[PDB]
Amino acid sequence: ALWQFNGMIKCKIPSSEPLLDFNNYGCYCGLGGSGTPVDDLDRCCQTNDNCYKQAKKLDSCKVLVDNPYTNNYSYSCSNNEITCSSENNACEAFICNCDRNAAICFSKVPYNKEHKNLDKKNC
Ligand SMILES: [Ca+2]
Ligand SMILES: [Ca+2]
Ligand SMILES: [Cl-]
């Protein structure tokens, strides 16, 4: 769920408010996404977007009355390291991994303010 994703990003980037810094950025960071990613951070979001898409394809996820944005899963942040729980069932575990990968990706690429609140005509 979005709440967990937010926590994961703060886990890797303690100085950030993910729902603000990583929302409405580039062509993919935020609800939806299309076009060519504008930078590596945007590409991180595209990958996470595609990961969610693959999740929806899983039989495990079709049974859930929740979407990746509201589907709660379990994880822990310790010493700024993210760990997905073995108590997560198939769908939740897949989503947890999608988010963990993105949070780590976000923390390893440049953040370009010029791409924040990007004019969708660039997508
Ligand atoms: Ca997106
Ligand atoms: Ca386009
Ligand atoms: Cl980690």
Swiss-Prot record:
Compartments where found: Secreted
Keyword Amino-acid biosynthesis: no
GO CC, any one term: extracellular space
Cofactor note: Binds 1 Ca(2+) ion per subunit.
Residue runs in coiled coils: none
Sorted UniProt keywords: Autocatalytic cleavage, Calcium, Disulfide bond, Hydrolase, Lipid metabolism, Metal-binding, Phospholipid metabolism, Pyrrolidone carboxylic acid, Secreted, Signal, Zymogen
An example Gene Ontology biological process: innate immune response in mucosa
EC number from the UniProt entry: 3.1.1.4
Cofactor list: Ca(2+)
Keyword Lipid metabolism on entry: yes
Catalytic activity: a 1,2-diacyl-sn-glycero-3-phosphocholine + H2O = a 1-acyl-sn-glycero-3-phosphocholine + a fatty acid + H(+); 1,2-ditetradecanoyl-sn-glycero-3-phosphocholine + H2O = 1-tetradecanoyl-sn-glycero-3-phosphocholine + tetradecanoate + H(+); 1,2-dihexadecanoyl-sn-glycero-3-phosphocholine + H2O = 1-hexadecanoyl-sn-glycero-3-phosphocholine + hexadecanoate + H(+); 1-hexadecanoyl-2-(9Z-octadecenoyl)-sn-glycero-3-phosphocholine + H2O = 1-hexadecanoyl-sn-glycero-3-phosphocholine + (9Z)-octadecenoate + H(+)
Main localization of the protein described in the UniProt heading: secreted
Family: Belongs to the phospholipase A2 family.
Subunit record text: Monomer or homodimer.
Protein name: Phospholipase A2
Classification lineage: Eukaryota, Metazoa, Chordata, Craniata, Vertebrata
Residues of the full protein shown: 23 to 145 of 145
